[PDB]
Every structure is written in structure tokens, then in C-alpha cells.
Design a protein around this ligand. Structure first.
Ligand code: HEM
Ligand code: HEM
Ligand code: HEM
Lengths: 735, 745, 251, 83, 84
């Protein structure tokens, strides 16, 4: 009955094993913790400015929100032991009221997201092309807050779904907040913002039954796509492995729209923003990603948090595609068309700076959930263009943030606050934090000598002025004829893919269309694919039991994009960029592990910054051949192959795990998913479960012992991400 | 010199770069020192009195925003170049959707308003401090009452009840008097009214009573008035309302200032000491400035001439250094004495007569600083009687019981969520730590690994604190509860006429006349005559003299049966209690009062010098009035600045009128000057006439020999000013009442 | 009520010009879209519902004066929502959790809501502990992990320190925590309530829902993998059974 | 939106049109209207593209803005004619 | 009283249902990072049923103390050992 009474006092273990070490530790070594407790020495101007709202807990009394000390937090106030609860229990009512009101509306789109703190630093001054203060000095450090997201799913949906990913960066500049709100693909599905609710309604769960969550694999999405060919380009990206990234650290970022850079002389240069991952480009395979939404719906959120806790800081290079004003009409596509990409072969990405994400938040709700990004948040030195999708976004973000964040003072929520000064004549509104002392709440005023005052535009610390673009035309609701091309960009993307990426696009479309109940929708989508590429259209049609007509086989292919048939920068894997730091290997233990193998495996993995998870049939410990006590991180079922990048089976008492269904399935799944597998000594007997002949094959590392050559072979395979050459062999594998 | 021309006459007013617009002489800036009302423009508290400070005011510095020498920016910190124009395609073209500066500015403006308070929507607030006279550790373990040297910052909001946030101050209504104590052991809110009782007994009836008093639902009329059918319909059918109605119909319902009214918690609460002993308590606020009220005609007309009179007077008194001061008082009743009275201690429609249980002086509260921003500090302030601290507890009073639920519930929608305690004005100054998370507008960033208890992950922190003599956890007094679950009023509450009778007989004859006139005026506004008759029938159960006088004014004749109604009994042997009268016991202070001085084009400087010297010595303010603004020149050449016109600052706004000598012919035939005196005369205010100004006695129908309340002499001097200040100490000239009815004003 | 001529384009100054603030059609369409979401339920945010009817077998006037239970021919329309507890509105169906079973009875004498779960008991004894228990089971505050799972430190920390939770924990750990369908689980009001008859006599009562389809549950590996292959499995099965005429029935 | 608690303020009885109103807008706080349309987007084939756009015409036609000619640079500037 | 109702439930289950309860606890506790929490939960299970606690402990590499093996089972519920 002591559990139902005040107080329980000290409940922590005497050994202090409840507390995680405040130092970089590998994933699973320590319990995860709020950022300021895990890495207190990791700081920047924004993190430091948040100290005034940080609340501790240690050695403090439990109180009401009014500061009244609570004596009993286990019971309601009642008339007797077994009596009715009394209306006068203000402690119960305050505690329950706050609980009852915890939830706020989720984001209309990108509701599912994971965020981190970091910093940006430019390589050199960009004063020749932009007067933006954050890009003016190589020694200028700009704090950032980045949120990565899916699009369709709710805040409680799964991470490894097939979707476009959001990549939003809040720059806390000395001249205002700049939000770069992008996606992991260089194009969007639609051309004009007016269609945004139509497209979103089509991709989102269907209105009658609210199915499916985090999936475009349903009738309404494909109905919209079939009737709106402008969507075909982004659909091609979503159907590719781009739609299933391995991690937020292994995907690209793009602003999509052409914006303008404005220099001190007033010269405008067209710009498209890019984020290039230091970890390279890497994606999952469909079966692995779908099953991973089951085994770990928080996979990406977890991987992001744990990489930062390990010191494997996600790093991205900021890049600009720069086009002079006089080159506006030099391309086959309209620069203002967000369904069109600018090929890197035509306009190269100029590396401008680097962003490092080095600290997790303290409280997910207060920092991540309440963060408000808006592409309308630009600074002097930047400007918009007439892109009709960007134009509409400018209205949307401010409007949605009012209801989501409960009013017009959302900029006063700590995460959203600028670190630079902010002063104006705006007043009141729900939850007003700032107390204005200004005698005047209007301008022009004489009572406060007209302060705060306007600042003229200038080279630095000047007021914002829009680029004086010449506008000529009649007031029309009309799409520009220049935007009326829908097939060349999807064709360019398709031909830029490797044959194995092309197979994955075919399988992506085939799987999704098989989930469409109305067959005519499938047929209409296949007809659209025939206007892109006949090989793609035939391969999808075959998987759907659809036969193409003679007329469909005679469809003239769309033209090249300014002479380009393909661009290898559009492929995830064509150009190698694979880094092993931060990757994870499963190590399948047995009851009498050969310690020499394990010592060599771990030493080689550590040298490359590759993590390991020791797996067994149960938790606790196992004892090696030399007496070394090995702690078990998880079971074979607990941390499936889906969650790792490679599998290593060291030697020892193999008979212990040879007939274990879970051990054999672990290898079969990793095999099917094209993951590198390494087998030492008697572990080579597992080749039988994966149908591999005695002579072996590429992608299966094997030797008498785990040593120098063995580990170099496995790490080289890990640098290539997956064993693509294994694809013809997986179809026979029951996994 | 005084011919300042505008810096803007052309298209430059539509362009950026208007730059410095303040006058070169710096006359735009008010002096950051105590100044009398109207001497300087009013200003935010931190700019007017920067040296006036307390723990709460100091803790608000982190959210205070400046302005001087700063760039005009968006809420994102982006410097604005042009705040005069929208972005358009050409100078005569359409506004562009891409104008984010316009949209942010208009969005914030479009969302400025929040719901007003359901009741007490009209209010005025100030910062201050409380300090107890001595330790009260024998009766309460409350930290704020434990040491005479312990200073507790306060935030007080005074209010009306019925009217909206934009309604008038000098209405006939009950007034709210809410005090937020920022104690070291939590926030304690003492949420009271200016009368010792409420209209109703059980909280379940609160929406019925409020809906009846509020504007009628079909047409939303009347504002700030109980003078309508529904209110009197409810009163006529609910005799429990009669006691507070008597207070509302008296001059208590029309206070002169928030500084000149009493405050009461109404409910019996409990004080809990370190030994666990409970003592029943009723809270009182005793005004240092004494008790003073307006008269009906004066109050009603003042809602027109200055709907902001009380808000204004409160703000200016603090700016002048005439700080509102109130003594905290306790009526203490031992637990064993619970059933010793004719009335139920838990009945909020019953007062505890001071003759039976005296008010014990406990401490003093001083309001010494105005807020910086009315919306941020006053509008967003959230008071709740449920906000008690260890050393205090509730009782079973059925009105208090329901209040405990209401305040938290209303504050969620009014203040946009459960984090309203994070709004700067509402924040405790003492530590606050718990496992509550999220909610709209969450400011606090919790670093605790645990958001639950019991927990081992944070070694169970924050932790429960056992109850104790000081710094202990809150524990409810272990009151014995015995009875069946019932929706039933206690028979003990079923007495409605003795307390209204006690109040009535405690009033002076002139206060009694004002109660009769209050009821008569209000009931004359009721359209359905049967309602008037039913109310008169209720008055006959209180006092026959009262009922007959009201009935006469309404053309109603009392029946033989009504004339034979047995009067209600005394209250524990008391027929009356002089503490219930505003004026029976003198307590009139002159400091902070205002005198209108009616100037002429050639004022006798000797009179004006003597008048101003004597007023200043007593801390009485003066306003120099004339037929126009600017200046007038005295007989000796002294240049006199005019504060307002006769029409601009009417007699309603002042406590007394002085007319010095000089060129009286200049103002003798001025309608406004004569009406000024006629109005002040009708409203029973002291009037002083020097030399040729005595010719004004003809407009007020006063004989050559004069009368009490009219100060007159050959010149304004020592005796003249002492006579006027003695009249001002008595507040009004009650003896003048029989003469005012013939006055056309 | 204004007829729209073109729902494909924003209003702009020229075919490649800026969007104009005067496009009231665009702004209304985007404003509504921008404000579609409302807060999800604090608990039981993931749920699936259907319309139906209730009918008593005989008059229960001897034990209760409740009008909906007074006549065997009295048909009471119902709205039922089945749910999980921990997960968001976008979380998966076949998680290991307790299930909600809420019934709204549209009676002739007012709405009666029978708000129950698929287990006969709850985790805790006093409502004061509800935010403590919920915060412990929900995603951890620093990183908002895990979704739809009690398989994390804070939940088991609370359970280890609060033995009153053990009973409902046993039920959650059993196959009761992974039902095959909402049609194949029991329902309970958990609390003892009172029935009051016309003579004023009180009888203590505990409410039960007995599935006509019987009791059936998944196995853990299947339930977990099914949160991946079909996170909408229960919502789908409920909708489709109704569309097929295989009406969920409960006594 | 803030004064009336959401985007469905047109469903408040006084604000309701007396003429028909049908579109693809959904949800929002206090949604009164229960949409039966299988589609909540356009173009759609699942509901044969209904509700449909109406071309502008003499009566009962769709709204079209007057094709005013716009010529000028993007400026934050008062017209001298207003001075 | 916290153990007699969990025991009644446990004893009312089929051996395959009991195996599934053991596996439920084992899988969940394997996901708990702090080992002392797993041990404290196993200690609670020992106050319910020793067969249940031992089976969960084995899957977690936890060894029950002599004191834990000597924990007296909670009483039956009004004479019932099981309710099918
Ligand atoms: C280039 C095409 C687009 C991109 C790259 C994009 C990207 C994003 C991203 C990354 C977020 C989430 C930011 C966060 O982490 O909180 C988001 C939020 C959102 N976007 Fe966009 N978006 C696009 C187009 C649109 C359009 C056309 C509209 C509407 C006209 C729109 C309306 C919204 C809204 C309402 C939100 C939720 C904002 C909030 O609640 O704070 N987006 N978008
Ligand atoms: C002794 C009888 C009563 C007294 C002295 C009293 C006094 C007051 C005062 C002074 C205020 C305004 C606080 C401020 O300045 O912000 C107020 C507000 C209010 N009162 Fe009472 N009240 C009484 C009874 C009730 C009852 C019975 C209820 C309902 C159960 C109630 C509900 C409210 C509500 C809902 C507000 C608005 C508070 C807010 O919006 O922050 N009051 N009361
Ligand atoms: C016998 C124990 C309990 C049972 C069976 C139970 C059951 C449920 C169910 C089924 C719902 C979802 C109704 C729906 O489909 O919308 C729910 C909602 C909820 N429950 Fe309970 N509950 C219990 C205890 C609690 C406690 C102790 C509290 C708080 C003190 C609580 C607070 C809530 C809240 C706030 C909601 C959301 C209601 C809404 O947003 O409409 N529940 N509960």
C-alpha cells in the first residue's frame, strides 16, 4: 500500500545506472537523453538564448503551476477513504486540466517529423552575388534548427514509408530569420498553388474511411496522377528508391523553386538551392522499408537522434545553381516551372557552405512540434520569383500557423524567436509575452520621436526592398503555355537511373497500381508511362496483366532536355559517394564465441566509425572461448536485419544457432535485401540457408577466420551500400 | 514659441524617411517624477516611475520591450524599408500576394482580440506590495503573513460586473477587487467584491443570475445597467438576492473612486496553523482614503462625460504619488463558534456584523506602480479564488465550492490554453516544477528525463514535500463530512429579510433616501408593471418605510395585508451596525481630491496664490478652467495656463468648486460657468465664492445671508480655505438635499 | 455560393506574372485547407467507427428505470468507436495495446455513452495518477519515441514502481493485447456503476459486451509485421465486414 | 478565422448562403456539412468530376476577373496622383 | 492488494496463452535499455507466479535470488484458482 502513499523518495539504483553518460556514445550503449543533459558543452547563439526558458527538476519540490508545494500526488481529495471526489480538489483539477489540453493540431502536411539543432558557415563571402548577411563572411556562424519529415502521414505515422521527404532549415541570421523550406526531390508534383488542396486530398487517406496512412498506393492518388500529367515527374522520383531513403543523413535537399539573389548594386541572379549530404546518397529497397514501418516505425527519428548522440553529426553542403537574368529563356523548360529540374550537366551546383547538425532538442513538443517554418521568411539579399506554386505558398504558411500555434504571437514561442533584435508597432493577440513600453503603437509618431524607425535599403544592415521586376500582362487565371510539357523531365530522370534503379521504379509503380481497386485507373497510368518511355510502360503493364495497344507502342518519345538524354547526378548510385561512418552491423553471437574473431571484427569496425550490435537468442550475457563476458544488445527478433547495414557471423559453437529459425531467417532477410554478409569459419555452413554454392559469390565474405583481409572485404562492400549483382538470385529465396 | 507647425504637408507623408518628428523643445516627453493629474501626458509605468520596484516588477524585465534607437522590423527580425506602402505591380497596380511585410502586419492586427472576461470584463489594474503588521503564526502557517519584514508583491484589478470591456466606469453595479499575492510559497489570489455578501447562495444559479443582469438576449440592451425587466424579474422570484440588491441600490453601488470603497472576500475561509488548528476567517480591505460615493444623477451623467473616470483616477493618483492604500482585515471565528450566530457562516448572502466579530488589522497594501501595457498585464491577468497557499483552506460555502471549478475552466478559452500561468503577469516569483507538459503556447522547455512520477530515471524529482510548519506541502484540513448525496439547499440558508433590514437601519436618512431613489429609478425602467409590484412586495418584507417610499414614486398602493407584514428579526440582537454606512462614522481624507477653479480674463492673483497654497499643503489637486484653452493674464501680470474648458472638465469630475475674484462680468453671463456651479450645487459639492464671485449665489438660489456648504468672503484667504477644506473632509453637503429639488440642473 | 469558372489557376498579372492579393477564390480554398486539422484525442487518438442499433431482450424495469432498457421493441440507434490507446491518429491498428470500445446510445431520454475498454480492469486506481501513467506509456518526451508501443523504459519504470498496474499489464502482455479484429474482442465498462429502479432501489452493475464472432487474437510476430504490411488492418476489416453484410454483433 | 473559431464560419446559420454551395473543401473545426462525395479533389473520375466548373456567361455562369491590363515594376510606392 | 488478480488471470490461461504472456513480457523488457528496470519487473512477476517470473528471467539472462524463489504466492480470489 506504500505505492499509493506520499512519498516514495529515492527510487534510483545505488549504482547510478539510470543516468546516461554526458559524452558521445554509440547507438544503444546508453539511454537516450534531452540534448542539454547529453551534450551540455555543445553550444551556439540559439541554444544559449534558450537557457532562460529551460526548466530543471533535480532537488526541486513538486508544485502546482502556481508554485504551491504538493504533499500527495497519488490521490484525489475525497470525503472518506472510499468517498466521492470533491470539487475543491484544485490540485487534481489543475493536473487533469493541463493533461486534457496537451494536444495542438498537427501540421496539415509534413505532420511526421524529426528535428535537430546545428550551425551553418559559408566557405567564402558571396557579396558579389548577394547582400545576405549570413553569406557575407566565411567566419560568420549562423545557428540552425532543421526538421526532416514525410508528407502524407500523421504525426504518429511511420518513418520508412514511400513518400517525398521534407527538409526544412531555420537560419537564425543577424538580419532576420531565413527559412529554407525544401524537399528531398528537385521538383514538386504540381505547377500552381491553387491545385495544392486537390493534390493533397488525393494523396491523403480517402475521406469516407480515412485509409491509407502514409501511402500513395490507393485509387484517388492514381486517379489524380492519371488526369494531371504535370505530376508525372515527381511521381517518377517517388516511385524510385528516392522515395525510401536509408536515413535523413543520406538524402539530398532542394528548394525546388527558382529564387533570386540580390547584391549591393541591385543585380538579380536566379538561384536554385541544394543540400548535398556528406554521408552520400543511400536508400532502402521496398520490401525492407515496408517491413521496417512494422518493426520500427520510428527508424529515421531514432537514427537521427542516435547519430547526433554518437557524434556522427549529419552534415550537408549548401549549393547554388546560378542563372544570370539574361539566361531566363535559354532553356527548353520554364525556370519558373516547379515541375521542371535544372540538370547539373547544364548548370552546375556551386558549393557555398556547410551545415552541421550537432545537438538534439531537450523537449520534442516544445522545440520540434512547435517549430514554424515559412518559405516567405526571407532576408535582404534574397527575393522571390513568379513561380505560381511559390507565390501561393507565401500566403499558406502564415495562415496555417495561426490556428496550429494558437495565434499571431507564434514568433514568441522560444524555438521560433529570432536571435537578432525585433521591434515594431504590432500589439496584443493571444498569449502575448512581450511587454511593450513604447508610448506609441503606431507610426508616423512624434510621441516616441518616430521610433522604431524604417531603415533605407543598403549594402549591409539595410531595410528590405523587393527587386523592381517589370510586370506586364492582363489579369488572368491562366497557366503559361511554357509549362505545358510533362514528359521530357520524367524521361530524363528514367534514363539517368541504373538498370537496378530502373527495376525498382518499375516495381514501385507495379506494387502501387496493384493496390488501385478500379482497373481503368491502372490502365490510364500505364498510358501516361507510354508517353515517357516504352520499356518502362511495357514492364509495368506486364506486372499488371495489361496489354499495350498498337497506338500506345507507336507513341513518339518526348525530346531531350537541352540536348541531354540523361544526367548521372539524378541517380542515387551511378556516381559512387558511399561513406561507412555511422553505419551498423549485426553480429550474430553463439554460446562459445571465438574471441579472436570478435576482437578483429570490432577493431576494424571502430577504425571506420562503424557501429555494431551484439545479437543472440535471449538477453543478458554469453561467454567467449577465452572467458570474455559479452553483453547482448538485443535478440535476433528484437533488432531484425532490416535495422542494420550488414551481418557478420563469427565462429565458435555454431551448432547452438545452426538450427535456430530466427538466426537463419536473419541471414535470409539481409540476403533478400541485398546486404553484405560475412561468415567466419564454421559460420560458412549458413551458406546453405541462402542457397549459395561452396565456391561462394560476390557479396558474401568468407574465410577460416575474421581478420585483416576478411574485414577489408566487408567494409568495401559496405562502402558500395548494397550488393546489386545479387538481384537475379533473390527471387528464388523464400524471405 | 507656441506655434508648432506640422513637418508634413506634401507627398513625403506617403514615403519612407519621415525620420525625427518630435518637437525640438522635447515637450512630447512626460517627466519621470510624481506629477499632479493633467500636468504631464500619462505614460507606461516603467517610463513614468523607473525607480519604483518590487520582486514581481523586476522579474518582468526579461519580457519588457524597448523602442528608442531601434530599427522597425518584421516579427522575424527583418528590417522594413517602407512602412507606408503595400507592394504592387506599378504605383497604381494590384497588391501582390508576395508582400509578406503587409501580410504579417495585417495578420497580427486581425488577431489582436481575445475573449473578454464572462463577468468583470471592465477593469483597471495596478502593481504594488503587501506587508503584515506582525507574525500571524499562531493562527496561520501562510508564509506571506509570517514576518512583519516580509514584503509580498501584488497585482490588483478593480472592476464592474455586468458591462463589457468597453463599458463605462461610473455605472450602478457591484465592484470587483481582486488581489494576486506573489508569495514565496505560491500565488494566492484574494478575489473579492466591494460588498460583504453576494446575490446568490449556490454556484448552480450563477448563469441564471448573470443572464438576468446582463443585456437581454434578443437585443443586447442594456449595457452596464441592472435597470431592466429580467434583472428585477429574477430578484422578485429569488428573495435570497435582496441583501446584495440593497447594497447595489445604495450609494455603495456608485463609488467615487476605487481608492474610496471597501473590499471583502465574502466567503468564510479557514486559516490553518502549524498545529493543524482551523479558525474561520472572512477577509476585508479597509481604504486609507476612507469610504466615499457619487450620487446617482452625477454617476449616470459621468458615464457620458467620462466613461473612463475610475480607470483615469486610479492611473493618475499613482502617477501623482497619491498611492491607493488598503488595510487587510480578518473577522476571526473559532471552530467551536460555527453555530453561535442566527445566520449560517457558510451562507454568502449573510454578512458578519463588525459589532459581533470585529475586523482585526493584519497588514497594509500599497498600489504604487501602473502597468506598462494594459493588454499584456491587465487584460491577460488571471485571478482565481482556488489559488490558495498552505496556511489557508476552503469551507463548504456552496457558492465558493462552484467558483473553484469555474475560474480554471474559463481561463483555458479566454487565455488560449493550459499554459496561461506562463503569461508574464501570471507567473509565480517562487519556483514551480512538475510533470505537466505540452499544451498550446508552451514556453517552458523541460529537461527532466521523466514526465511522470513515481520515477527512478530522474531519482523521483521533482518530489512531494510533507506538510509542515513552513515550506511544506499542501494538505486539506480533515473536515468531517456526514450526509447523503443531495441537491438541496440547507434550511439554515432559508432566511432572506433580516440582513437587508439590518443594512437599511444602519444607513443615515440621506443614504436611505438614495436607496429609495435607486429602487424607484431602476423599477421605473422595468416595462412590465407586475414586476415593479412584486419587487415592492419584497421590500415590504424588509421595511415598511422603504416599501411605502418606493411604491409612492411608482404610483403603487400597498394593500392592508402588505402594511401588516411582520418585520424580520434582529441579527443576534442587533438592529443596526454603523460600520455598514458609508458616512455614519467620519473617515474623510482630502489628499488626492480635485477642485475646479473657475477663471476670468483678469483674475485677482492674491486670491489664486492663497487658494493654490492652501490646497497644495493638503495634497488637493486643482484644475484651472476657462471658456477657451490657452492662457489668461492675472491683475498683476501673472500668466495662468488653462487646464480645460468649463464644458471640457465638468463639475462631475471634481470634488469642489472655487470661484476667485477679478473680472466677474467676463463669466457672469456665461451659461457654461453658471451651469458648472448649478451642477456642483445639485450634486451636493462644496462651493467657495470670493469677492464679486458671490454674485453667483443668485444662479444657485442662495439668499444674501448664505448657507452651510457655500464658503463666502471678501477675499480667498486663511479662514476661507480652512472652511472649504473642512467641507471637503465631509465629502458632500448632505444638509443641502431639501434645496436641490427646485434647482433646474 | 459563387460559381467558379477556373479551379486550375491562381489569378496573376499575365500568364507568368505574380499572384494577386485580390484572388478571393484561391485564398478561400487555401484558407480552408490550412485550417483542416483539429487536435487529436489526448488518448485513443487512433480509432474506427460505425453506425448501428441496440435492442433489449426484455424489459429491465425491475432493476432500472432507464428508458432504452424498458421495452424489448424499443430500438436505440448507436454510434460506436473502437480504438487503441497510446498511438496518434496516424498510428498503426495491430499494435500491442489495450483497445477502446465506446458506444453512444441515442436514447429517448438523453444520450448515454458507455465508454469502455477490451479488458475488465484498468492499469490505475485513482484518476490523479492518469497523467503519470499516460506520460509513462506515451512516447518519451525528449525524442517522441516509441509510437504505439509500451516496449520502452518509462512504461516499465512506472509499472515496476506501481504494482497496482500489474493486473492490466498481464492482460496487455497476453494475446488480448493483439486482437484479430474489433469484432473478435470483448468490451467492458470496467467500473461498478449503479442501476436505479422506479422504487429507488440501487443495484451495482458492471457492463460487458460479448462478441457474436467469438474471441480471437493474432500472434506477436504477425501483429508487429502487420503494422508494417497494413497499418489500417482493423479499420479496413471493420469497414469491409459492414460493406459485406457481416455485421459486427455484440451482446 | 480567429473571431469565429475556424474555416467553417459560413456554416453559422446567419452566414449561410440561400443558394447551393458545393466544393472539395473538407474538415476544419465545427464541420457541420457531411460530405457524401467519393472524391474530395478535382480533376476526378470517381465522381465523374462533380461538382464541376461553370464557364462565364450572361447568367448562372462562373466567376471570371475583368482582364485589366497591368503594366509596372514591383514597387512599394504611393501613386503621385494620390498626393 | 496487487497480486491475486494477475495470478487468477495467469492460471486461467491455456499453456500456449501462458507461453505468449511470457514472450510478451520477454520481448518488451528486452527493449528496456536500463537493465535494473527489467530486474525490478521480474521481481514483481515473482510476487504473482514463480513459473511466469522464472520463464521471463531466463529469456532476459536474469537469475532469481533464493529470497525471490521463496516468495509466498498471493491468495485465491474467493476460493477460485482459475476462471475459464
Ligand atoms: C515546392 C513545393 C513545396 C515544398 C518543398 C514544401 C515543403 C514543406 C515542408 C518541408 C514543410 C514542413 C516544414 C516543417 O518541418 O514544419 C511544409 C509544410 C507545409 N506546407 Fe509546404 N511545401 C511545398 C508546397 C506547398 C504548397 C503549394 C502549399 C500551399 C499553398 C503548402 C502548404 C504547407 C503547409 C500549410 C504546411 C504546414 C505548415 C505548418 O503547419 O507550420 N506547401 N511544406
Ligand atoms: C462571492 C461571490 C463572487 C465574487 C466576490 C466574485 C468576484 C470576481 C471578480 C473580482 C472577478 C474578476 C477577476 C479579475 O479582475 O480578472 C470574477 C471573475 C469571474 N468570476 Fe467570480 N465572483 C463571485 C462568484 C462567482 C461565481 C459563483 C462563479 C461561477 C461559479 C464565478 C465565475 C467567474 C468567472 C467565470 C470569472 C471570469 C474570470 C476570468 O475570465 O479570468 N464568480 N469574479
Ligand atoms: C476505466 C478506465 C478508462 C476507460 C475504459 C477509458 C476509455 C476511453 C476510451 C474508449 C476513450 C475514447 C472514446 C473515443 O473513441 O473517442 C477515452 C478517451 C479519453 N479518456 Fe478515457 N478511459 C478510462 C480512464 C480515463 C481517465 C482516468 C481519464 C482522465 C482522468 C480519461 C481521459 C480520457 C480523455 C481526456 C479522452 C479523450 C476524450 C475526447 O477527446 O473526446 N480516461 N477513454
Amino acid at each position: 500500500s506504500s505505492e499509493a502513499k506520499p512519498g516514495m523518495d529515492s527510487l534510483a539504483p545505488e549504482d547510478g545506472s539510470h543516468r546516461p553518460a554526458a559524452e558521445p556514445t554509440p547507438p544503444g550503449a546508453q539511454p537516450t537523453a534531452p540534448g542539454s543533459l547529453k551534450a551540455p558543452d555543445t553550444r551556439n547563439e540559439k541554444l544559449n538564448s534558450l537557457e532562460d526558458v529551460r526548466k530543471g527538476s533535480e532537488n526541486y519540490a513538486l508544485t502546482t503551476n502556481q508554485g504551491v508545494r504538493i504533499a500527495d500526488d497519488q490521490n484525489s481529495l475525497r470525503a472518506g477513504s472510499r468517498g466521492p471526489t470533491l470539487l475543491e480538489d484544485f490540485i487534481l483539477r489543475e493536473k487533469i486540466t493541463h493533461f486534457d489540453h496537451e494536444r495542438i493540431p498537427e501540421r496539415i502536411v509534413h505532420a511526421r517529423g524529426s528535428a535537430a539543432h546545428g550551425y551553418f558557415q559559408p566557405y567564402k563571402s558571396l557579396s558579389d552575388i548577394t547582400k545576405a548577411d549570413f553569406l557575407s563572411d566565411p567566419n560568420k556562424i549562423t545557428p540552425v534548427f532543421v526538421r526532416f519529415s514525410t508528407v502524407q502521414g500523421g504525426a504518429g505515422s511511420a518513418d520508412t514509408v514511400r513518400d517525398i521527404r521534407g527538409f526544412a532549415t531555420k537560419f537564425y541570421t543577424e538580419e532576420g530569420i531565413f527559412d529554407l523550406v525544401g524537399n528531398n526531390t528537385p521538383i514538386f508534383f504540381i505547377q500552381d498553388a491553387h491545385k495544392f488542396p486537390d493534390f493533397v486530398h488525393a494523396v491523403k487517406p480517402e475521406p469516407h474511411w480515412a485509409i491509407p496512412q502514409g501511402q500513395s498506393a490507393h485509387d484517388t492518388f492514381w486517379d489524380y496522377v492519371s488526369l494531371q500529367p504535370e505530376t508525372l515527374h515527381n511521381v517518377m522520383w517517388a516511385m524510385s528508391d528516392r522515395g525510401i531513403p536509408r536515413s535523413y543523413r543520406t538524402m539530398e535537399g532542394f528548394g525546388i523553386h527558382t529564387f533570386r539573389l540580390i547584391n549591393a548594386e541591385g543585380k538579380a541572379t536566379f538561384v536554385r538551392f541544394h543540400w548535398k549530404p556528406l554521408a552520400g546518397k543511400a536508400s532502402l529497397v521496398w520490401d525492407e522499408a515496408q517491413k521496417l514501418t512494422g518493426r520500427d516505425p520510428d527508424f529515421h527519428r531514432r537514427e537521427l537522434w542516435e547519430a547526433i548522440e554518437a557524434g556522427d553529426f549529419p552534415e550537408y553542403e549548401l549549393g547554388f545553381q546560378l542563372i544570370p537574368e539574361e539566361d531566363e529563356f535559354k532553356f527548353d523548360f520554364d525556370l519558373l516551372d516547379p515541375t521542371k529540374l535544372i540538370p547539373e550537366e547544364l548548370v552546375p551546383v556551386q558549393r557555398v557552405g556547410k551545415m552541421v547538425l550537432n545537438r538534439n532538442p531537450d523537449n520534442f513538443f516544445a522545440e520540434n512540434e512547435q517549430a514554424a517554418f515559412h518559405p516567405g521568411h526571407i532576408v535582404p539579399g534574397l527575393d522571390f520569383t513568379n513561380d505560381p506554386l511559390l507565390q501561393g505558398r507565401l500566403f499558406s504558411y502564415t495562415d496555417t500557423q495561426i490556428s496550429r500555434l494558437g495565434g499571431p504571437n507564434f514568433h514568441e514561442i522560444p524555438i521560433n524567436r529570432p536571435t537578432c533584435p525585433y521591434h515594431n508597432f504590432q500589439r496584443d493577440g493571444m498569449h502575448r509575452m512581450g511587454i511593450d513600453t513604447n508610448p506609441a503603437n503606431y507610426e508616423p509618431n512624434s510621441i516616441n520621436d518616430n521610433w522604431p524607425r524604417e531603415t533605407p535599403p543598403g549594402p549591409k544592415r539595410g531595410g528590405f526592398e523587393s527587386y523592381q521586376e517589370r510586370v506586364e500582362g492582363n489579369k488572368v487565371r491562366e497557366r503559361s503555355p511554357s509549362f505545358g510539357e510533362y514528359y521530357s523531365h520524367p524521361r530524363l530522370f528514367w534514363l539517368s537511373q541504373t538498370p537496378f534503379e530502373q527495376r525498382h521504379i518499375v516495381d514501385g509503380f507495379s506494387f502501387e497500381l496493384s493496390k488501385v481497386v478500379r482497373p481503368y485507373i491502372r490502365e490510364r497510368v500505364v498510358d501516361q508511362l507510354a508517353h515517357i518511355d516504352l520499356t518502362l510502360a511495357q514492364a509495368v503493364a506486364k506486372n499488371l496483366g495489361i496489354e499495350l495497344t498498337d497506338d500506345q507502342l507507336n507513341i513518339t518519345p518526348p525530346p531531350d532536355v537541352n540536348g541531354l538524354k540523361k544526367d548521372p547526378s539524378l541517380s542515387l548510385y551511378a556516381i559512387p559517394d558511399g561513406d561507412v561512418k555511422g553505419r551498423v552491423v549485426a553480429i550474430l553471437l553463439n554460446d562459445e564465441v571465438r574471441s579472436a574473431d570478435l576482437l578483429a571484427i570490432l577493431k576494424a569496425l571502430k577504425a571506420k566509425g562503424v557501429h555494431a550490435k551484439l545479437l543472440y537468442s535471449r538477453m543478458g550475457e554469453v561467454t567467449a572461448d577465452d572467458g570474455t563476458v559479452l553483453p547482448i544488445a538485443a535478440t535476433f527478433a528484437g533488432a531484425p536485419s532490416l535495422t542494420v547495414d550488414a551481418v557478420i557471423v563469427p565462429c565458435g559453437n555454431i551448432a547452438d544457432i545452426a538450427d535456430n529459425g530466427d538466426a537463419n531467417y536473419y541471414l535470409m532477410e539481409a540476403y533478400k535485401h541485398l546486404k553484405p554478409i560475412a561468415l567466419a569459419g564454421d559460420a560458412r555452413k549458413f551458406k546453405a540457408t541462402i542457397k549459395i554454392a561452396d565456391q561462394g559469390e560476390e557479396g558474401i565474405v568468407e574465410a577460416d577466420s575474421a581478420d585483416g583481409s576478411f574485414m577489408d572485404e566487408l567494409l568495401t562492400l559496405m562502402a558500395a551500400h548494397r550488393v546489386w549483382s545479387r538481384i537475379p538470385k533473390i527471387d528464388k529465396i523464400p524471405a
